[PDB]
């Protein structure tokens, strides 16, 4: 049973839009952003950055 599903929309930083998405066509598997005055990081599948 789901006891909770926190869904959020994080921005993609400038250094990822240009260096990753626009340059290589890829996106990082980690979302590092600022939410509620706090540095929050999320790892996809709780795995390493890819």
């Amino acid at each position: 049973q789901f006891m909770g599903i926190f869904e959020d929309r994080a921005p993609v930083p400038f250094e990822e839009v240009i260096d990753k998405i626009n340059a290589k066509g890829v996106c990082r598997s980690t979302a590092k952003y600022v939410r509620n005055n706090m540095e929050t990081t999320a790892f996809h599948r709780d795995d390493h950055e890819t």
């Binding site: 049973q1 789901f2 006891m3 909770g4």
Partner: protein, 50 residues
């Protein structure tokens, strides 16, 4: 001089008419929505409060 003559006049065709305009009203029908509100509440019970 040769005096002018009155025009014979337009020949009118008596009839019954129905005027249709472009339809803009959406098509409406009755539907039934079946769902379930699933609410999971996480409560921390303090010394005096919840």
């Amino acid at each position: 001089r040769r005096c002018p003559t009155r025009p014979e006049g337009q020949n009118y065709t008596e009839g019954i008419a129905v005027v249709f305009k472009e339809n803009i009203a959406p098509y409406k029908f009755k539907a039934t929505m079946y769902y379930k509100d699933v609410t999971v509440s996480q409560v921390w019970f303090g010394h005096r409060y919840s």
